Write a protein that binds this ligand. Structure first.
Ligand code: CLA
Ligand code: CLA
Ligand code: CLA
Ligand code: CLA
Ligand code: CLA
Ligand code: CLA
Ligand code: CLA
Ligand code: CLA
Ligand code: CLA
Ligand SMILES: CCCCCCCCCCCCCCCC(=O)OC[C@H](COP(=O)(O)OC[C@@H](O)CO)OC(=O)CCCCCCCCCCCCCCC
Lengths: 742, 81, 222, 41, 211
């Protein structure tokens, strides 16, 4: 029966364990014999499963840690709003959003770093921000810095509230295991009460605050004399003169004459020509509809009033001849293992973030977002990287579950067992498809390189050569361009300006969006993307499926999840642990996301982003050379890496010099990672022995014996520095280039 | 508005759903549906004054679903005719 | 043995009838002793109900009293205003008192703190307010075993409930009137938003033309 | 306070405090005595 | 020991047993849990109180007498800006040199009680003080009021400078914040509050949403 269950005062609030560093584990609670202990102290701090076998205590730790993360995020958001309130030119940007660069960070005049306070416009000097917060606040109807201040104060209050909630739910009233295992109630509340009610509330804000303020802004009204939101809520005649349907006043809602709300609940599609963003009427209708859908969907599961679904009975009822018991035993897996839930949720969150990245540039939801090329590029790249990291983490935690939380006795002839039983076939076919994709994409690039170098441009794979047209994607674009005509008759515009139709939105003198063409280069780059994704999936899935055992080491589950090797026997067992598979999948996700963001940047600078003149001539940032230069690896090296890097390396002496500094520093960090990746551990241990001799000669040798990093730690440091260097190099390069050319 | 087609449709939908739930023609708190769509009896634990076993939660569920279906029918008939 | 509103098998296990307003209505099982915690526990919820109900009795009889007394014509008409126009929500309406409403709020916070903190300390540590010196009248504020019913020389100065039967019946009456007042204040709030006039104005509008003055006709806001 | 002082005496907290103090000292020195390549004496 | 407390209902902390002057069991953060550090904090409170008393006497009394017209003190905030017979930085350095001796001798008394009680130039002077923080003698207790014999009556004599001291500390903090906020003298703020207490408050200059 679904009920509230807590324990009073489980843990005493005391600083006694603060003085003891490794209190959470029996091994580290003894003391630091060696320096490795310190690293171990930071590598097992949040591994709550390793601290104890009690699932209740692990659940309580997880809940309180989530509260702490929420408090941290609240502090971060409050900081952003504070910096918008004081150290920003938000109001000047409101007065003129097309010619003033957003800025919300101001440096101190200490060591000549004051040069970084560039002339962003509006009588302000500071760092040009690319987070899109200005456009988000413009969409929300924020017109003054006082509103940002009150938002920041509320954010601090909420951070303190979350911090107190974590303390209360760990040390004062800690929920019991039965409370955490109520997955049906949790889903009902998070669907109806979290997503549905949140969407409804945001629709209310939009209807009452965003639409009137933003339509007055689109009309050219100076934000100073735009009436405040509460004046729209109170003086409803002032709101009705913008949208007459408000004069009806909730009568159409309850009489089901909903068409009378067509003034502010539209299904237009496309972009607002004035701002280049989505119509906020469409957004309000969207949020209302999804709120209704989520509130309906959150009434699906049976908590204690009958009427509903038992997910255990749903799962046990889904089985077939090609499988065994089907989805039998998965309810226990997902209600008794935190790592399985973390894997599922991480995979979904990463894929969702990638969807967000793809959908926020094709439909810019904020005003003056598309024409802010720097913000668009930054948002796309940021969310791509976040999604990739989350997917790799999902793989890691699936492997952790398979190693530690997997119980063969309760999993017999179900789906997990059967997947484990034909992993050889799965990995064989995935390896074959990876090889085939790698060949028929990168070998096509190499073919193009060779024929271009041999003076045989007619033997290449291009539009003026052997053509590989993406006919399926082109057909999908054609279908989506004609959707309002026949397939969605109640639509004014198509889903996005990227499908087709010959419509070009040009806020100011720039280009917001236009029909994106697909040719041989797009065919090639999408197949490169598919190749990289399949190879990453190969590495990660092979790590997960072979985590427990393999033909080499049949007892790999006893070895654990995070172990270096099993020895130099059987020819060498280096990197047989699933942790090492995640370690390599990080490199492959890095390559995949890097190529994805490079393709986005080049395609947008070449075919979409640009400036339109009064006559109507559209010139692009690069000049439309993607169709003929992206087909060749030399073209990528020259027309993208060499041509577009001219600004990061020439940024010295200007406000973009920090980008060049961090460009070179990220190069440095990557090269530094290379030695943790290439070197071993015995060499460094012996070098440390020599250094320890030098220290002992002078009676300055520490009692905490210096040790070289473990093998797994060496790999972790190498991959961390590698990813940091590469990603920061790209970050500096994109930001400098897109701030210079935009 | 009482004699309007929207009112008639909504009243009919809600009444039909309540009748189906009360008289064992639809799932309820004490009427579980199996995988074969056969209705079996269960002890929801909610005591009600209804002799048949119609609870307040059953009434709320049937009314909500009846309103959902009635809104669907009303808007569909408006869009088509 | 008693009226049951929406009881259940789970609720009736711990709701037996000791409490005054006990009718087994606990569809959410919020007073289950098995998972008692900080504020969701059997010791606090009846107390919180009583306190919310007492403040709601003061509210329902106070949010409409000036309007009624001005309608019958014995208070000044400028003080005969709807509750939401008395400065509680300055945007909808404001009134100029001897002090600005934030100074009044600080004074209210000080006084209500001196009262409410003492009430809390008597709830958590019963009898602790009758020991330390408090202007010499700490002996009046000693309370009894039950936190919700101090019944001292101050809190009970007409001396009701000499016998236990009348005392318990009076408790039940208090709980019922408090629940009614709580629902009435919720009605005050929702009607203030949906109508824009005071509760007495809504009552008179309904009493004038009941079929054209109700929620169905008056969810047009204005 | 014994446990709080012990925690504050741990390596990372003391490192943070000491390095922050050093950074503040250097920053203030550069505020009042900036852009010097030669020690004047 | 059944003593009045800052919070009547709650129990007092174990380290605050009521043996100290001004003890009311007020230690919600538990900063006096270390007895060796608790003694240091006791001394810190004592000297802070005795400095804040002189600060309030040199801030509010001259301001009130200037408003009455008897004196012409410059409002205790621009007091540093006026010209003297020496520069402000030179005055600060003289103050540091001249206070190093006294503060170091009090420091030695705190660290090593019972010492530094004898005059170095004329050993025959001495200080007849027993407790730390109450030097006594003749320079510091010329009327001989700190030595009463009765422990309870002496503690009653104490707990008064602790209380006047805490009040003066709060008063000086209020004076600083009020000068920063209202840009006006403290006695002028008092007269403004007494002029119209319902409106001349901290919210007079805050200008919140509704008034
Ligand atoms: C959480 C996200 C976040 C981030 C990344 C930043 C980042 C920044 N803030 Mg913002 N800020 C935030 C949240 C955030 N803030 C919030 C929530 C508030 C509201 C309280 C503020 C209020 C705020 C103000 C009012 C100011 C900043 C300023 C700054 C900048 C300089 C930081 C500084 O002064 O430290 C300086 C360093 C210290 C305070 C550390 C001192 C302690 C060390 C360890 C030495 C101690 C030695 C010894 C023990 C004594 C920096 C860009 C400043 C700025 O941009 O000026 C132009 C500035 O004036 N912030
Ligand atoms: C309508 C009810 C409701 C709502 C709104 C939420 C909302 C949330 N839950 Mg869920 N939860 C619910 C019911 C609900 N829960 C029930 C019934 C159970 C038990 C079965 C759980 C069990 C549960 C667990 C085990 C966890 C969550 C977590 C979370 C948070 C995830 C972070 C996020 O995206 O939030 C986005 C929104 C915000 C950050 C807004 C701030 C939060 C506001 C104040 C809403 C808080 C609603 C709260 C449930 C009301 C009770 C508190 C009240 C007494 C003050 C989110 C705030 C996770 C978390 O992060 O924990 C902290 C987590 O680990 N919940
Ligand atoms: C949770 C979201 C939310 C919230 C809190 C509000 C709150 C409000 N709305 Mg809004 N409204 C919302 C969503 C929301 N609305 C949505 C999604 C729609 C589209 C269907 C509307 C359409 C709408 C109209 C057409 C009117 C209101 C009105 C009102 C006000 C009076 C009605 C009430 O219950 O109070 C109130 C300020 C009324 C108003 O402004 O009266 C002053 C009014 O006439 N609302
Ligand atoms: C919802 C997200 C989420 C959550 C809750 C967890 C939770 C956990 N993970 Mg998983 N993980 C995630 C996402 C998540 N992870 C993602 C996205 C990845 C892919 C990278 C992984 C990959 C991963 C692996 C491979 C392992 C874990 C492990 C763990 C456990 C932590 C033990 C530990 O050593 O941490 C303590 C915290 C750290 C070690 C972090 C230190 C700082 C990192 C390494 C570098 C910071 C980079 C920084 C941004 C650089 C710039 C700043 C710099 C200049 C200062 C815990 C169960 C471990 C485990 O359970 O072992 C059995 C383990 O082996 N996770
Ligand atoms: C540019 C560097 C580079 C190249 C070319 C490769 C190539 C390959 N890697 Mg390796 N890898 C690299 C860097 C590289 N990797 C790095 C830095 C890492 C560290 C993270 C890894 C980690 C890694 C892992 C963990 C895995 C791979 C896998 C693969 C294979 C991909 C699929 C395949 O075989 O078909 C595509 C093959 C190619 C693209 C190779 C070039 C072939 C060209 C196009 C044709 C040339 C032939 C031509 C006729 C000349 C003939 C020569 C003849 C005259 C002698 C392939 C062997 C995966 C694998 O085993 O395959 C499924 C795998 O699991 N690699
Ligand atoms: C579709 C028809 C229908 C519906 C929707 C309901 C609905 C309800 N009945 Mg039932 N009832 C019905 C037919 C129906 N009844 C019939 C045909 C009879 C036989 C004459 C009853 C006899 C009956 C009794 C005796 C009681 C209810 C009660 C209730 C209410 C439960 C609370 C609920 C609103 C109970 C009630 O009013 O509780 C508040 C109650 O005591 N009903
Ligand atoms: C009298 C009966 C009746 C009639 C005539 C209609 C008629 C209609 N309904 Mg309604 N409806 C009914 C009953 C009825 N419905 C009932 C009982 C329910 C359940 C509550 C619904 C729920 C419902 C929803 C939720 C929606 C409709 C929609 C529609 C329209 C279909 C257009 C469309 O998208 O199809 C073509 C759809 C596809 C080919 C599938 C698209 C593929 C995925 C799902 C996207 C059409 C006017 C839609 C509408 O109003 O759009 C304008 C809509 O969104 N109906
Ligand atoms: C103490 C309970 C109580 C009482 C006596 C009233 C009385 C009244 N309300 Mg209010 N109301 C209440 C609670 C109450 N309401 C609550 C809790 C809400 C929030 C849901 C509302 C929301 C509300 C609105 C929005 C409106 C009224 C209106 C009215 C008038 C009747 C016309 C109508 O449409 O009613 C509608 C009644 C409801 C929507 C609430 C019904 C359910 C509650 C619990 C009342 C149950 C009454 C019950 C018999 C107990 C009565 C106690 C006693 C008199 C015997 C009338 C003056 C209308 C008005 O002002 O007309 C001009 C109007 O527009 N009420
Ligand atoms: C010894 C304690 C003491 C006393 C007697 C006063 C007395 C007064 N203060 Mg000062 N004040 C104090 C401490 C004190 N304050 C402290 C510690 C602060 C810092 C938070 C302030 C900050 C402050 C401001 C910013 C203002 C006053 C004002 C006032 C006047 C009352 C109106 C008002 O809004 O008060 C507000 C009082 C507080 C915000 C704090 C009072 C807290 C003390 C400890 C209560 C003692 C009893 C009055 C002359 C106002 C004034 O000048 O009126 C014209 C005014 O604007 N005070
Ligand atoms: C060519 C293979 C086409 C498989 C088309 C297909 O989806 O088959 C679906 C096939 C049918 O199984 P059932 O769906 O009947 O099993 C019931 C499920 O609900 C239990 O999960 O599932 C499998 O046998 C395992 C996966 C097949 C192997 C996938 C290799 C590709």
């Amino acid at each position: 029966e679904v009920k509230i269950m807590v324990e009073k005062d489980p843990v005493k609030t005391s600083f006694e364990k603060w003085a003891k560093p490794g209190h959470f584990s029996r091994t580290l609670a003894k003391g630091p014999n060696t320096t490795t202990w310190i690293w171990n102290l930071h590598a097992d701090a949040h591994d709550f499963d390793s601290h104890t076998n009690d699932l209740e205590e692990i659940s309580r730790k997880v809940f309180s840690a989530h509260f702490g993360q929420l408090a941290v995020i609240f502090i971060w958001l409050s900081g952003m709003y504070f910096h918008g309130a004081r150290f920003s030119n938000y109001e000047a940007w409101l007065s003129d959003p097309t010619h003033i660069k957003p800025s919300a960070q101001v440096v101190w005049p200490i060591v000549g770093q004051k040069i970084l306070n560039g002339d962003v416009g509006g009588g302000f000097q500071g760092i040009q921000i690319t987070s899109g917060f200005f456009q988000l606040w413009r969409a929300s109807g924020i017109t003054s810095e006082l509103q940002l201040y009150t938002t920041a104060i509320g954010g601090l209050i909420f951070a303190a509230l979350m911090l107190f909630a974590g303390w209360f739910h760990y040390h004062k009233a800690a929920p019991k295991l039965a409370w955490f295992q109520n997955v049906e109630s949790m889903l009902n509340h998070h669907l109806a009460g979290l997503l549905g009610l949140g969407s409804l509330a945001w629709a209310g804000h939009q209807v009452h605050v965003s639409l009137p303020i933003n339509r007055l802004l689109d009309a050219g009204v100076d934000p100073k004399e735009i009436p405040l939101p509460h004046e729209f809520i109170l003086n409803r005649d002032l709101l009705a003169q913008l949208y007459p349907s408000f004069s009806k006043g909730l009568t159409p809602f309850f009489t089901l004459n909903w068409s009378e709300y067509s003034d502010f609940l539209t299904f237009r599609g496309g972009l607002n020509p004035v701002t280049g963003g989505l119509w906020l009427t469409d957004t309000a209708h969207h949020h209302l509809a999804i709120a209704v859908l989520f509130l309906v969907a959150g009434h699906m599961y049976r908590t204690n009033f009958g009427i509903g679904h038992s997910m255990k009975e749903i799962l046990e009822a889904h089985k077939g001849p090609f499988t065994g018991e089907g989805h039998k035993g998965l309810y226990e897996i997902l209600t008794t293992s935190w790592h399985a839930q973390l894997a599922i949720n991480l995979a979904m969150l990463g894929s969702l973030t990638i969807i967000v990245a793809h959908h926020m540039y094709a439909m810019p939801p904020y005003p003056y977002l598309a024409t802010d090329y720097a913000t668009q590029l930054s948002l796309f790249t940021h969310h791509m990287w976040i999604g990739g990291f989350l997917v790799v983490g999902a793989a890691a935690h699936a492997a952790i579950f398979m190693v530690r939380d997997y119980d063969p006795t309760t999993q017999y002839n179900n789906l997990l067992d059967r997947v484990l039983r034909h992993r050889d076939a799965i990995i064989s076919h995935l390896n074959w498809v990876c090889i085939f994709l790698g060949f028929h994409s990168f070998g096509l690039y190499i073919h193009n390189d060779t024929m271009s170098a041999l003076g045989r441009p007619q033997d290449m794979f291009s539009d003026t050569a052997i053509q590989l047209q993406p006919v399926f994607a082109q057909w999908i674009q054609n279908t989506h361009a004609l959707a309002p005509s026949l397939t969605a008759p109640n639509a004014t515009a198509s889903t996005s300006l990227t499908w087709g139709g010959g419509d070009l939105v040009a806020v100011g003198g720039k280009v917001a969006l236009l029909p994106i063409p697909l040719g041989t280069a797009d065919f090639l780059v999408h197949h490169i993307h598919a190749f990289t994704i399949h190879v990453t999936v190969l590495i990660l899935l092979k790590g997960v499926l072979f985590a427990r055992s393999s033909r080499l080491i049949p007892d790999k589950a006893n070895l654990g999840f995070r172990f270096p090797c099993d020895g130099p026997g059987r020819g060498g067992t280096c990197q047989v642990s699933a942790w090492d598979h995640v370690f390599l999948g990080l490199f492959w996700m890095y390559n995949a996301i890097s190529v994805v963001i490079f393709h986005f940047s080049w395609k947008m600078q070449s075919d979409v982003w640009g400036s339109i003149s009064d006559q109507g001539v559209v010139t692009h940032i690069t000049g439309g050379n993607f169709a003929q230069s992206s087909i060749t690896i030399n073209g990528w090296l020259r027309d993208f890496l060499w041509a577009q890097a001219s600004q990061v390396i020439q940024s010295y002496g200007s406000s973009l010099s920090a980008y060049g500094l961090l460009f070179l520093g990220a190069h440095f960090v990557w090269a530094f990672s290379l030695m943790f990746l290439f070197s071993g551990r015995g060499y460094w241990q012996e070098l440390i022995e020599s250094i320890v001799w030098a220290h002992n000669k002078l009676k300055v040798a520490p009692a905490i014996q210096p040790r070289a990093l473990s093998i797994v730690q060496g790999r972790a440091v190498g991959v961390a520095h590698y990813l940091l260097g590469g990603i920061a190099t790209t970050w500096a390069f994109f930001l400098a280039r897109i701030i210079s050319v935009g | 508005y009482i004699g309007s087609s929207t009112n008639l449709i909504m009243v009919a939908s809600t009444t039909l759903m309540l009748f189906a739930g009360r008289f064992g023609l639809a799932p309820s708190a004490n009427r579980k549906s199996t995988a074969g769509l056969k209705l079996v009896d269960r002890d929801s634990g909610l005591q009600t004054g209804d002799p048949a076993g119609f609870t307040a939660t059953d009434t709320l569920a049937c009314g909500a679903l009846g309103h959902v279906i009635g809104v669907g029918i009303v808007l569909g008939l408006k869009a088509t005719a | 043995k008693r009226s049951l509103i929406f009881a259940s098998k789970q609720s009736l296990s711990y709701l037996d009838g000791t409490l005054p307003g006990d009718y087994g209505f606990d569809p959410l099982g919020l007073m289950d002793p098995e998972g008692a915690g900080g504020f969701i526990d059997p010791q606090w919820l009846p107390y919180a109900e009583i306190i919310n109900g007492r403040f709601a009795m003061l509210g329902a009889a106070g949010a409409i009293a000036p309007e009624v007394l001005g309608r019958i014509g014995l208070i000044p008409q400028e003080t005969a205003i709807p509750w939401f126009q008395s400065g509680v929500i300055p945007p909808v309406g404001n009134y100029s008192y001897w002090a600005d409403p934030y100074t009044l709020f600080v004074l209210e916070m000080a006084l209500m703190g001196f009262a409410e903190h003492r009430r809390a300390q008597d709830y958590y540590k019963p009898g602790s307010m009758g020991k330390q010196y408090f202007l010499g009248l700490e002996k009046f504020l000693g309370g009894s075993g039950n936190p919700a019913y101090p019944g001292g020389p101050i809190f009970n100065f007409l001396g009701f409930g000499k016998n236990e039967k009348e005392l318990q019946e009076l408790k039940v009456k208090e709980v019922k009137n408090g629940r009614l007042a709580m629902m009435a204040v919720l009605g005050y709030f929702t009607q203030a938003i949906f109508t824009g006039v005071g509760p007495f104005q809504n009552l008179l509008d309904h009493l004038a033309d009941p079929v054209h003055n109700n929620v169905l006709t008056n969810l047009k806001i204005h | 306070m014994q446990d709080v002082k012990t925690y504050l005496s741990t390596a990372p907290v003391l490192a943070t405090l000491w390095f922050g103090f050093l950074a503040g000292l250097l920053i203030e020195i550069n505020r009042f005595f900036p852009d010097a390549l030669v020690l004047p004496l | 020991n059944d003593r009045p407390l800052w919070f009547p209902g709650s129990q007092p902390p174990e380290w605050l047993d009521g043996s100290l002057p001004g003890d009311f069991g007020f230690d919600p953060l538990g900063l006096g849990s270390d007895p060796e550090l608790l003694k240091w904090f006791v001394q810190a409170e004592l000297v802070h109180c005795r400095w804040a008393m002189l600060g309030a006497a040199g801030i509010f009394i001259p301001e009130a007498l200037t408003k009455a017209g008897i004196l012409n003190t410059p409002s205790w905030t621009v007091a540093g800006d006026q010209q003297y017979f020496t520069d402000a930085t030179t005055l600060f350095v003289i103050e540091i040199i001249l206070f190093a001796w006294a503060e170091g001798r009090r420091w030695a008394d705190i660290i090593n009680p019972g010492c530094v009680n004898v005059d170095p130039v004329f050993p025959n002077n001495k200080l007849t003080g027993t407790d730390v923080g109450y030097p006594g003698g003749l320079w510091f207790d010329p009327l001989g009021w700190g030595q009463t014999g009765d422990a309870a009556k002496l503690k009653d004599l104490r707990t008064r400078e602790i209380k006047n001291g805490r009040l003066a500390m709060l008063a000086v903090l209020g004076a600083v914040v009020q000068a920063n906020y209202t840009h006006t003298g403290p006695i002028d703020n008092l007269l403004a509050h007494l002029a119209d207490p319902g409106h001349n408050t901290i919210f007079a200059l805050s200008n919140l949403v509704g008034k």
